[PDB]
């Protein structure tokens, strides 16, 4: 599945 899906934030 998806690589680098949440590198810009967690909120």
């Amino acid at each position, epitope marked *: *599945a*998806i*690589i*680098g*899906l*949440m*590198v*810009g*934030g*967690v*909120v």
Partner: antibody
Amino acid sequence: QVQLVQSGAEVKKPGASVKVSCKASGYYTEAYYIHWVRQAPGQGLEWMGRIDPATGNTKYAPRLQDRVTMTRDTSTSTVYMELSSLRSEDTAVYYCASLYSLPVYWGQGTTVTVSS
Amino acid sequence: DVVMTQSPLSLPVTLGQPASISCKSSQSLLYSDAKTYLNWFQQRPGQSPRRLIYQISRLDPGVPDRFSGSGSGTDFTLKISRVEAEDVGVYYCLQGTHYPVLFGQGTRLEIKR
């Protein structure tokens, strides 16, 4: 890889409501949180909120919480943003964007004009 | 609420000089992993905004080597080693660690003559 396509230019009157859509397409559109951001004339970028398409769960900028809603349609992988009680300082370019992903995938922008 | 303070607001730079932009948060942006969600965005006139950098120092694809990022916790800097005319625009930090997500107020970068 995802691609976001927004609804076109809108002209609305003060006090009214506007609804902007963002059609997602690609593999696993449900795994990307969609954000809305806006830029008024001269003004800085302002973050309006995100929706999780998986669950429909939303978070809003506090300055706007009372006035904006974010909704989803899973059959059509579309997300919607409704801004109520429009005043003229809401005239702006509104983008949807997967701000958390690498790279960020952007909509092309929708222009909203508040005026009689 | 976490508060983001970008500095300076307007940045006139002689062509070919280096430049830096400062972003300070009111609290740390270190999250429960060893990861720090500070991002840097650019908007040039007439264009859509783009992300330049994610996680303090990591370049997005398409971003030239001239842009670099640094800092930790509550204090961040965006460096441009050599300013060209294509760097004219507004630059924003964005904090992705604590609700609510929040852009800095923007730094306008222009060429000085």
